[PDB]
Design a protein around this ligand. Sequence first.
Ligand code: SIA
Ligand code: SIA
Ligand code: CL
Ligand code: CL
Lengths: 471, 470
Amino acid sequence: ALTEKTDIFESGRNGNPNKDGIKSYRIPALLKTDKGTLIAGADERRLHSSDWGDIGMVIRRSEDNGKTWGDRVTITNLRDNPKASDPSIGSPVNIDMVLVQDPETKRIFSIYDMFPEGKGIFGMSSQKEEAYKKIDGKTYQILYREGEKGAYTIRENGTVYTPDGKATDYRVVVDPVKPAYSDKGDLYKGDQLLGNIYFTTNKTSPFRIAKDSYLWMSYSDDDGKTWSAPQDITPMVKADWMKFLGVGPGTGIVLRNGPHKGRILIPVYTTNNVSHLDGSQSSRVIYSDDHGKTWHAGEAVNDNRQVDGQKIHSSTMNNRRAQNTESTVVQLNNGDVKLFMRGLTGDLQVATSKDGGVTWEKDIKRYPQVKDVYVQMSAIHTMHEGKEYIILSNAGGPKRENGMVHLARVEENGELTWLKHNPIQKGEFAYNSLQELGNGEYGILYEHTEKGQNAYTLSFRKFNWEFLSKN
Amino acid sequence: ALTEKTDIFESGRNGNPNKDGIKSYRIPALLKTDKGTLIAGADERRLHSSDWGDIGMVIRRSEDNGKTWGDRVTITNLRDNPKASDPSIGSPVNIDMVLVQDPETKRIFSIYDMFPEGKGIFGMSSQKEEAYKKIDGKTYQILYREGEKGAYTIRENGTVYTPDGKATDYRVVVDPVKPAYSDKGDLYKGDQLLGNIYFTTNKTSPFRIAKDSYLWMSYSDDDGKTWSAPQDITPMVKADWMKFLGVGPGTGIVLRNGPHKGRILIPVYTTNNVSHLDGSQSSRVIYSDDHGKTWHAGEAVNDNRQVDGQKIHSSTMNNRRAQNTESTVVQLNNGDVKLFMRGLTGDLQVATSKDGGVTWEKDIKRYPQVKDVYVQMSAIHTMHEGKEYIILSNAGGPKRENGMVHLARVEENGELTWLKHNPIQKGEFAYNSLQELGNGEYGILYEHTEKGQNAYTLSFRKFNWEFLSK
Ligand SMILES: CC(=O)N[C@H]1[C@H]([C@H](O)[C@H](O)CO)O[C@@](O)(C(=O)O)C[C@@H]1O
Ligand SMILES: CC(=O)N[C@H]1[C@H]([C@H](O)[C@H](O)CO)O[C@@](O)(C(=O)O)C[C@@H]1O
Ligand SMILES: [Cl-]
Ligand SMILES: [Cl-]
């Protein structure tokens, strides 16, 4: 009814790197594909456990439902700045992934954050730098040149254009060829490699992108075996007011019923320039109705939300306790969308959308039955049998420790009743990603440490319904 | 060389309404049309001199170079909330205009601010309310209903649609017909008038627009005698981050030379939600390249500007001294665009655009030869002999007093060499608008009070080259 842990991504120990040179793994995502393959995603955090540095977006695959796992496949790994004074912050950053498969096209998506070199979400410029320019319908990423105010642009074939629209002899690698696409952003003057547009210190080229928060996507048309080059989806979904825009890591969904069936939903969250991480973190979804081709932002749960008798908006709020951050998303059988959101109330908060995640109902339902120590969670829809349920897993607390699996009945109303709450990992426990495996079995990939392991080792267990019923 | 003043818009005296029941006139705009006509526009501030209340946008015409003047024509006057507890704040507000004529189509444009009922720029809601929604390629204005979270929309024919897209029995007057378009925004159910979508207190109807800052445009195709209904240009130019977006009052320009010849430029300024009016006021222009049909926002002077060693952006800045607000715009013969901006440095701040006002060069030039007491100004291009010059008019100081006309020579590289500084009005002097008349003589419509007049009475004077040259 509950297996022993199988370590999928093993961290080093006692502050040293592991055999592969990697100190740390974080941020699990678990996906069961149509071929019944399991894909386990993670941040490969080479130098340290923090939310920056040299981080690879990696997966392993299991073709026997979680028993054995293949070699690490690197989706994206941007090259470090070799001239960086501090290598700990000396790399363009990718962090936090969401996995989802399109049930129709079979195409698998990994959506993840990107930052240029520096400290990620803790190292964003205090003043806005414009990141994109629309020139005659077409949107181009801007480049800033050493000692100049104007916006250069990256146009077709990566040709750098001057602020007043003349081709230069500078080229950006927009179609990277190297393993894990480490050549992405490389800046050339004709045939000479000069540097990289994602480097921000001790640069050997004239050009850098805006110091901002970006959102990238890579896909696989062969069950996770190979991956496309990164697609920059930021300009489709990020408004000019948004400071940070990033994924709520884990596994996204495709809507299975209602008038929006087929819609891909990816949890994200933003901050604003009024209060940033202190009081503006706000959950929402981005979505696609054309099988991952184009993406749109839905509204935030916090948009026109009533809080302490006054209305807030995600773009302007400064309310620590009204924040909702990383979230996990589930569609019910009655068409509704539930968003379970990390937050600061000490218990679970849940928003409901009736239009397929575009807008959210007036009230956030809180559930004191499920604690929330302010850490990521995952939740999936399950049938048993045929009564409707939701499985949710997160830290039991008091801190990031004692991993719990929670079971709720979904009432024919759309309401939820919490029934059973079962420990699944004693000791350290943080992020996790649940999946349905079939025949009453469920998989979980999660963050844990023991015997001096660096934060974190990512381990996998299976369980069945009998595990869930314990009281 | 300098005529005595002709009062064009007369304010009340001693805190009382004038003979028309108007306490105050503010915010001159002066427009010399193709026909020779002078159009003097103003805020007609009925109840008090403050930046809110019951205000009409009004003009008077002169066909004899300012000697005689016709009757006031009211461009727009939104009706007051008849149920407001405090009438001094109980009206939807129009405030601050910019006039300009298209030299090709001859169309005259009045661009001005609009707020729903309340205290204008001084009563803006702390949190964002989204004002517009795009649905299937179309942008619709949003309505909010008491007790509901979702966005109603004003669609085709003014029919109100529910958050989820059904027609209701409600409709808005989107094509107003009453004098001064005082019916604009009226909320009907069937043929029963219920209230107004611009009303924000003691409402008799279920619906209101977002409490935000809007930009409206009305146009004349008959030398300013009659005017179109207001056109809401906000969604074309206002980004989601902007809090306030409003005009820099006076008279805008059409570019006469260079790659962008024919571009209509209108000075505006924004605030942001980080620091609002304390640290974010930022000049820029909006513009039209198709004769005022569609409008675009240029970048702010403050966008990627270096201030005390550090880059700022108009959307994120919190810097009182690096603010720039109302401005006046001039195109030089070499094609450069100069923007003279009201600021907090004591002297004249000037920005330069090399691309027809879309982006601005890295330095703001300060000219200590011209004092700025933090008050609006106007400035125009003029050819004499013909050498290229700029005339700028504002207050000399130390307060809003002693009006000046300034002459600068514009050098081939666009640098300004200030030649002459001649006083034009003793005591009270605030906003003003300059025009070229022809000989050349030069007109100035300005704010000034004497003899217990309420702020302000708006008076007109002519002056010629030899007055400037003193
Ligand atoms: C992009 C990014 O930084 N993601 C990280 C977030 C954010 O820092 C917080 O959500 C900010 O509130 O949280 C973690 O630090 C955490 O709680 O373990 C890890 C995660 O990778
Ligand atoms: C829309 C509006 O309120 N306009 C008004 C401005 C602004 O309040 C300030 O520029 C804000 O900083 O200032 C005046 O009061 C002024 O200085 O005489 C008059 C003007 O009509
Ligand atoms: Cl570089
Ligand atoms: Cl009403």
